[model samples]
Target: PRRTPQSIPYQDLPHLVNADGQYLFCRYWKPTGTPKALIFVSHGAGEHSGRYEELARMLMGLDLLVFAHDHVGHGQSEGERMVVSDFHVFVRDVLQHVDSMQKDYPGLPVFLLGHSMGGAIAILTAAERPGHFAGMVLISPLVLANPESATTFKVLAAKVLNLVLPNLSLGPIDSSVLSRNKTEVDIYNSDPLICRAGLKVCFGIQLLNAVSRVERALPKLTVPFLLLQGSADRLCDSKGAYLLMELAKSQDKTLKIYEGAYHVLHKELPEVTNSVFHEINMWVSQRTATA
Candidate 1:
């Protein structure tokens, strides 16, 4: 099991709507008073909302309301574990949850925090609904995915597989880029919250296309954004973060890189995570104050 601080109280509850597809679950922590802002976190590939409990607690302590739900095919959601037949459909469900959240907490600036695969979804979601969000936090997003076969092969394979076996899981993939953390690997393998298989073929196709879309949409984004990348992140090309930082049209956008930090910087490195939460709190404080 991963280490957790005592300050955080975690819970697992089903999504407002129950279906056999994926059992969506949410983890929430709020302070006593009306929150200055609300955050909805999207976890990376294979990981679930429970992993963000500590971060949620940190935000709550900052007097901000925090809510995170596991995406379909991941976490507690129904469906094949970690497998989605269609990428956009999964993202639509996420948008639905966020839209409901926005309505539930009126007047507060709603921020989207997406990590890894979730980052790609967040960027596309914000781009699709430019006025729906106040800002975004992208942490080592999969805007540039791990290298795979060329585009032509991926497209052809997905088309063929989707027709024959859409529910098939890709199972674990091979990646030489990891930081060689035994503890992280062990937890990932055993953690109930982490998906232990590969993705559906169509899901992979959609993910690739979404990454490209996010890359192209960077210039059109007007909302303030914060991007965090770890120098030692092996699951993605760190250059993606730098590229977005350079091209984002948001005047308030910023990118910070953590030296020697791995893919899960928030959990692998406490000091860096603390600083990130502090920055989030301050950014929200000022943004909400003026809004």
Candidate 2:
């Protein structure tokens, strides 16, 4: 019988200082032994901290302390769930969480891992702060939008709909685009943990703003990083990921593209997903050893 890896123990807490009177909810996973490094994972838009349970478990087995926080307006956190009023407020909140974690576990190497929207925010944050973090990992980051729509359309859509349908749920697009598996799409739509609103126009606008900030600030990034993308991912563009690789000033930067995997590689291709985890483990482990 295959031995099941023990799950990482976690605690759910609220960020005390978020605007909009919302609690920045997060899950803290502590490993059994002294952690080699502490990883703070910032989830993409529409998903919550709970989406990372499996990822945390894998990191725990690797003896890494992990923390995942739900961005304001999503998950169990406080705010208008699915609406986007303040964009950088989320970035500021993530920075606060990183600092708080650093204080709790002194001397441990700190790394930021961001996915999609979270990836873009992570890049912008790391660029701004520079030496505050040891390294970063951007998984299928949103440096550019898939659709080449004009900025005016995005802004006008938000303005027109902000008052009319503030909280309306936009159902999932064609399941075909989500993954090759029909079951995956069904489960995504049916899952209680998944957000059903499906990216509002206001949320889209906020994402565009975040994308712009991250792209404009890329030249300033000095920290080492790992950028991973799926070649078949419809939500994120391969060119954007590659452009970051070219622009990043870090000689330590690396990238991996899963040949046939979808946007959510961790979920869509778990069997081979260890390729990423193992690479990250070795990268951080080697860096920590040298430091």
Candidate 3:
């Protein structure tokens, strides 16, 4: 396991108490000028919000106030590491934080950004309150399971296991597939906050349930959204991105599939990563301008 860092960078780092009484570690990034809009980020599974400081700073540079929170059972948040009683808790927690943001900065158009498992959360969150967000950005969402393990029998077995031994460890994700950039892969492997352990049976079941719910709710997704997927990603399949683009009712939906890119498009090599950020900035800028 990796060691936790003593400190992390943020404009404001605070803990928000959830309905369950857990203090979720949250952070904010403010721009020098008045923020044109607000962005709430939900990070991937097994990773915490602190890993997104670089990406958050980039958005802040564009005059977007950024907010992110460590999910319960991950990072500094209070819960069992890499474990959740139910996936709906994740969606509820996101809305809870968003409610606070709306109270603090009323009238500011808010955009939701999520990566990996967080993308699923963002999708469900937006579906829960259609038209609430100005836009949503999904980075390699986990709507579909990877091909090798997505077999019907395997899924059935997992579902059975979820009932019998919900907390049993499944297996760890292959860190090498995270990015083509070796350094980023190394950093992730060594990151203390990143859970490099096996997925719990209950967590896996909840994730599958969330994916199913999101697919059913796709037609109700009326907010403008952008879905970014790397064609070469070995974890979450790119086909899911295409499926979402087709199912979503948003007329302004955009899907960008990066050829040969890996799962972590935002953390890829400098050239690739910069392009992803540029694309995001341009998309958000266009929407905010109209709003």
Candidate 4:
């Protein structure tokens, strides 16, 4: 009975209902041949599964079955736009979808790919199920809040404001800071499925909570992982990448930092973007080939 904010029928989309009875729009990319591995992509805040189509296609060539869903409150999903009751809801939705998929293709190696805030979700999800995944990939994960905006006073102010005005707009993300490639930036800005609404006070609180959780949850991350970050990324601080590499207990870990690349490495300048894809493909292919 729930209707998408876009006014489209949920019944028409490939979706799953969460515990909140919200529909989560999903996308699937199956290889032409048998799949040797399975991957789940957790997109960033205000983003949709559709944005990862090209990445999925590239992985499909490696004989992978890739899947993802727009988290509740995001594009094509049923919830208040850019709103969530709690950050755990997103993690749980991911586990539910992964569990459902694993049932059909037992024994295939599984991997996780997440960007920005979604990286927080992937980390928490992997932490919950130790030794379960073959590997994980994080791009500019939000393990720590940026210093400029996360000053003690501002963080406290945000919390206080959340109590009094949970729905107040904190303003939308500046798309210009997303990449050096103007065309990719333009494509991001033009995407109709992307939510431009500013983040709400409640959502900010949840993001803070997620960052806190991710920091503490790092030691539980035992799965092999590859982390990519842009030193100049404005949205997610590179400090988070440093924190992750040092904190996570995973033995097989690779961390790469692109000196001047901005956030959204997958959609950044041609060199960084190509390098990102190459790193992911090479890493994933090796693991799946052995598994």
Candidate 5:
């Protein structure tokens, strides 16, 4: 199990206790005035919520309170690092936080923002409880496996390997695919809490299962959603974003594909990233105003 790196000061960080008693390390950013809405972020795999501090600050500028948590088995949370018995556990835990946030904020509109693996979890959570969220924002969602790795034999191999050596490491993710900015890629590489370890067999299996489930549920997804993808993203399949835009039952849906952006659009070049931030702020503002 990976231990947490040097910690942030207790006074500077907030924490939440999920229903199952897991102490999920969380961060909150509040606006200068009363919050008009709330945005709960679910971060990508192998990374922690801390990476989104800048994003939270930007959202706060829009008078939205932002909350993000390090999922169990990641970052400061209590669990075996990068391991889960089932993918649904991630969705359930997100709902636990959502329920807590709803109780705390009462009537304020709340939205979910998920990136990569977190996007899958967010989609599943919304499907399980329709009309619960004001809207959803998916950034490079892992709704489909990367084309390079989705070979028929490999998929079958994962199923068999999961039952035998569930913890076997598949391979390390190419850190360069995270962003085009070298500095951003370097920062991610050096981050102590980021899970640089290879993907585990069982984890991969769970992810594929989640992808299949989400694909089938797409037609039933009625929540207003914004799907953003990068044409150059080498990790997640951008086609999933297009498929989502085509199949979702939501009357209000938007999809934007950035030309040269990488997988983590939020961490790309300043100009590119800020543009996405502004777009999200604008979208959330419009929805919240109407809600």
Candidate 6:
């Protein structure tokens, strides 16, 4: 009688319990035939794995096996929404999930696709086992702290309010700034699975910790990556993308910038979103064929 009733949608989909013994919602998109390669998606903070349905399905068209799980505290997964004891837990779960997938399909190449905070998780995960990944794709990744939001981190560090008020609200992000597409923004705003409870003070510290860790990981990165960013992204700094291109020693790292766009390029304006998918499919397709 230890198990309690979870969310209806999560119960409907396949899921895995992390080392913490918490259920993490999982999403898998497999091809009808043998897959050309494998894709492991890491969705953003506040969002569920289901949000990447469109991207996963697009990669599926290329015959790639795509899999992902909502982080421990996000979406339908257990634990308080958008909370984590440490950022490394995210990286740890990713390695476990990917390792499990590799078992079923050995010798197949694997790729990492992450958005926002998920992007930082992707970087650290790839760093732990640099040889495990064939490549990676990032969409508006959180490589650096947003200038406007940087103050919160410094204050969180100085005030140490987290000792007593770790769950204090830091205000939620404005959904309207996520994308230029009204419909997509509407969907994101309305999505019940997304954690709109505003970022917790302690979690903000974890994010700042992630940024520094991601920078260290940048220099160690050698896997090929396709980096997409919105020039005007207010959440994740665009300069971080530039810094990545400079620091990462990837022999085949590509950066595509969409000017005047905001965060969440995958769900941005029609043209931008189309181009984003095109780049991902073509990049992944090329590598899958040779493997």
Question: Best candidate per lDDT, number?
Answer: 4
10 residues in a row with least lDDT, candidate 2: 1-10
lDDT of each: 0.73, 0.75, 0.87, 0.90, 0.85, 0.87
Q: List the residue pairs that clash in candidate 2.
A: none
CA error at residue 57 for candidate 1, angstroms: 0.4
TM per candidate comes to: 0.84, 0.86, 0.92, 0.96, 0.92, 0.94
Which clashing pairs does model 3 show? 171-198
Model 5 deviation from the true structure expressed as Cα RMSD, one decimal place = 2.6
lDDT of 1 by residue, 43-93 (tens): 877778887877788778877788877787677655556666556665677
Error of 1 at 141 (Å): 0.7
What number of backbone clashes does candidate 3 have, counting pairs of residues 3 or more apart or in separate chains? 1
Worst 10 residues of 1 by lDDT: 1-10
| Superior by TM-score: candidate 2 or candidate 3 | 3
lDDT tens readout by residue for model 3, 33-57: 8888889999998999998898899
Clash tally for model 4? 0
Q: Which ten residues in a row are the worst by lDDT in model 4?
A: 1-10
Error of 6 at 97 (Å): 0.4
TM-score of 1: 0.84
Compared to the true structure, candidate 3 yields what TM-score?
Answer: 0.92
By TM-score, how accurate is candidate 6?
Answer: 0.94
Which parts of model 1 have CA positions greater than 4 angstroms off?
Answer: 1-14, 18-23, 148-150, 165-184
Q: How accurate is candidate 4 locally (lDDT)?
A: 0.90
Can you write out model 4's per-residue Cα lDDT over 1-291, one digit (the tens) per residue? Answer: 555666778978899888888888999999988999999999999988998988999999899999999998887888888888889999999999999999999998899999998899999999999999999999898788756666789889998998889899988878889999999989989898888788898998889889889888997789899999999988887887988899899999999999999999999989899999999999999999898
